[PDB]
Amino acid sequence: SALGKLQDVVNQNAQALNTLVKQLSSNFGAISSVLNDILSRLDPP
Amino acid sequence: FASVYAWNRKRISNCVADYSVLYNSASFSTFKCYGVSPTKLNDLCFTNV
């Protein structure tokens, strides 16, 4: 009133989940990152 | 109609754009859209033309 070996696990796991969430906003070479804006202004082919 | 090296640009704004009077009109030789589909232009909204 020390615990860094326990805070390291919490931090590493949050840092991985954040990267997974944030990769949902890359185009990977498409026109939009959001699927609804490809579906709305393009036709199936 | 101006020539190819001094083409004229008109900005369109503040109006409903009905491509229905244009897409169901069989009077043009080429109608090629890129990034959009000429049948879904009445569902979108645009910032400028």
Beta-carbon contacts of B31 under 8 Å, excluding residues fewer than 6 positions away, are: B23, B38
Q: What is the DSSP letter of A9?
A: H
The CA-atom distances, in angstroms, between B14 and each of A25, B17, B46 are 31, 9, 10
Distance from CA of A37 to the nearest CA of B (A): 10
Experimental technique behind these coordinates: cryo-EM
Q: What is the DSSP string of chain B?
A: ---TTS-------SS---THHHHS----S----SSS-TTSTTS---S--
Residue B36 tokens, joined: 């959009």
3-state secondary structure of A2: coil
Task: State this model's resolution in angstroms.
Answer: 2.8
- Tell me whether residues A41 and B35 touch, CB distance under 8 A: yes
- Tell me whether residues B36 and A31 touch, CB distance under 8 A: no
The whole-angstrom distance between residue A21's C-alpha and the CA centroid of its chain comes to 2
Q: Is A42 on the interface with B (CB under 8 A)?
A: yes
Q: Give the C-alpha separation, A12 to A18, whole Å.
A: 10
Report the sign of the C-alpha dihedral through residues A24, A30, A33, A35, in that order: negative
The CA-atom distances, in angstroms, between B29 and each of A40, B32, B36 are 26, 10, 19
| B44 and B36 Cβ atoms separated by less than 8 Å | yes
